[PDB]
């Protein structure tokens, strides 16, 4: 969208990944599988949670009786009351709807952010030991068993340990 990851180069979502909002799909011989990155997902849940709880919990409301009843020689008062009520209703309607719109856009952009930043996190670890295949996917030059994958996931990857094999496999490509 605003960062070109969700609905951008990553065409769609993974219905099989239930561990969270953001995650990984690996393809080492040992087998495939889906996982979630609980760090970014958890930070996103905390942020969004705080947003919603900030749009709700911030509404102070004193004890108030909106209704006022007037007679037939108090039409000025009755129309003044009507004017107050209608004014507040206008304000809250407008500001409420625009708030929902604007912050919905902001939320979607926030997810798009998290995914792009995650992709870049992986990219900066694999500079020459892999190529950018398709979209939201890297192909390795050295074979990366489960342990290695779970290494990319928790940040620690150890690049020079696999740099040589990669240097070989890359030349002919």
């Amino acid at each position: 969208g605003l960062f070109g990851a969700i609905a951008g180069f990553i065409e769609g979502g993974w219905t099989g990944m239930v561990d969270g909002w953001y995650g990984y799909h690996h393809q080492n011989e040992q087998g495939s599988g889906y996982a979630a990155d609980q760090k970014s997902t958890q930070n996103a849940i905390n942020g969004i949670t705080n947003k919603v709880n900030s749009v709700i919990e911030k509404m102070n409301t004193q004890f108030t009786a909106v209704g006022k009843e007037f007679n037939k020689l108090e039409r000025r008062m009755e129309n003044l009351n009507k004017k107050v009520d209608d004014g507040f209703i206008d304000i809250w309607t407008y500001n409420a709807e625009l708030l929902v719109l604007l912050e919905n856009e902001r939320t979607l952009d926030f997810h798009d952010s998290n995914v792009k930043n995650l992709y870049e996190k992986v990219k900066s670890q694999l500079k020459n030991n892999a190529k950018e295949i398709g979209n939201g996917c890297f192909e390795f030059y050295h074979k990366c068993n489960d342990e290695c994958m779970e290494s990319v996931k928790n940040g620690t990857y150890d690049y020079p340990k696999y740099s040589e094999e990669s240097k070989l496999n890359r030349e002919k490509i």
Binding site: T64, A65, G67, E69
Partner: protein, 54 residues
């Protein structure tokens, strides 16, 4: 007056609040509908009335 509940006459109803220490005095030679029961209350604040069949 036009018959309302079949009555050409009327009674105009009146009320007031009597704060502690103060004294209310009625005087009349006729046409008075005296009070029988009054209501000793403490106030409360800021509410309204509801008109529904719920």
């Amino acid at each position: 007056r036009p018959k309302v509940r079949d009555r050409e006459g009327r009674i105009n109803y009146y009320w007031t609040l009597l704060e502690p220490g103060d004294t209310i005095i009625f005087e009349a030679n006729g046409n008075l509908i005296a009070p029988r029961y009054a209501f000793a209350l403490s106030r409360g604040f800021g509410s309204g009335i509801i008109n529904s069949n719920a």
